[PDB]
């Protein structure tokens, strides 16, 4: 039981490290969403110009 408790504390520390990975993935996902919205507005502008032509 003592050895299993030690290994579970190690797993908890690894969970904290993967929480840091989660926050980095969160800010990456926000940048991905913002860039994708920029691509859509570029597409909308190009589609309108093609419609005028």
């Amino acid at each position: 039981g003592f050895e299993e408790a030690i290994t579970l504390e190690e797993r908890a520390q690894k969970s904290a490290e993967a929480q840091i990975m989660l926050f980095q993935a969160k800010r990456e996902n926000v940048q991905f969403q913002l860039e994708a919205a920029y691509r859509a507005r570029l597409h909308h502008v190009n589609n309108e110009i093609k419609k005028r032509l």
Partner: protein, 161 residues
């Protein structure tokens, strides 16, 4: 471009090695909802269709409109959208760092306690050579005069009513 939209991601392999399933079932949303931001990232490139101005010059008697529209298209460039969530994410990251530091400190204290208990139990005298007082020294529950008594001093002969 298509650099940080189409051809980039975050390694989910190390993410799934820590999450305790039902405790972090929102990861099933996080791997899926962000995948939605990957699915729209499958669409939406920078330039979806370049304009063949030569084709419109050939298809129109007066190509001055084609040249004017080409000049207007080249004169307009959309920049990257504004951001106001960066400070919020940095604040969440700082709060996460403080909570992780606190949790690591608590884990260090619990590890030290468990190692002390394991060392104490390793250093105990074996039960074959243990007198009935060395057992009561290593297990200080004992049986005392101001204690709930019984002729069979057991774990359930008193109270429980």
């Amino acid at each position: 471009a298509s650099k940080r939209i189409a051809r980039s991601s975050i390694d989910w392999a190390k993410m799934a090695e820590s999450v305790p399933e039902s405790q972090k079932a929102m990861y099933n949303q996080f791997k899926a909802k962000s995948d939605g931001y990957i699915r729209k990232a499958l669409s939406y490139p920078e330039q979806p269709s370049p304009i063949n101005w030569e084709h419109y010059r050939k298809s129109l008697t007066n190509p001055a409109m084609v040249d004017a529209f080409k000049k207007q298209y080249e004169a307009l460039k959309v920049p990257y959208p504004e951001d106001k969530v960066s400070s919020q994410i940095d604040a969440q990251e700082a709060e996460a760092k403080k909570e992780i530091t606190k949790f690591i400190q608590e884990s260090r204290g619990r590890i030290e306690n468990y190692k002390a208990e394991l060392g104490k139990l390793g250093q105990m005298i074996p039960f074959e050579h243990m007198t009935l007082e060395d057992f009561f020294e290593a297990f200080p529950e004992k049986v005392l005069n101001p204690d709930p008594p019984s002729p069979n001093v057991k774990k359930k002969p008193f109270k429980n009513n």
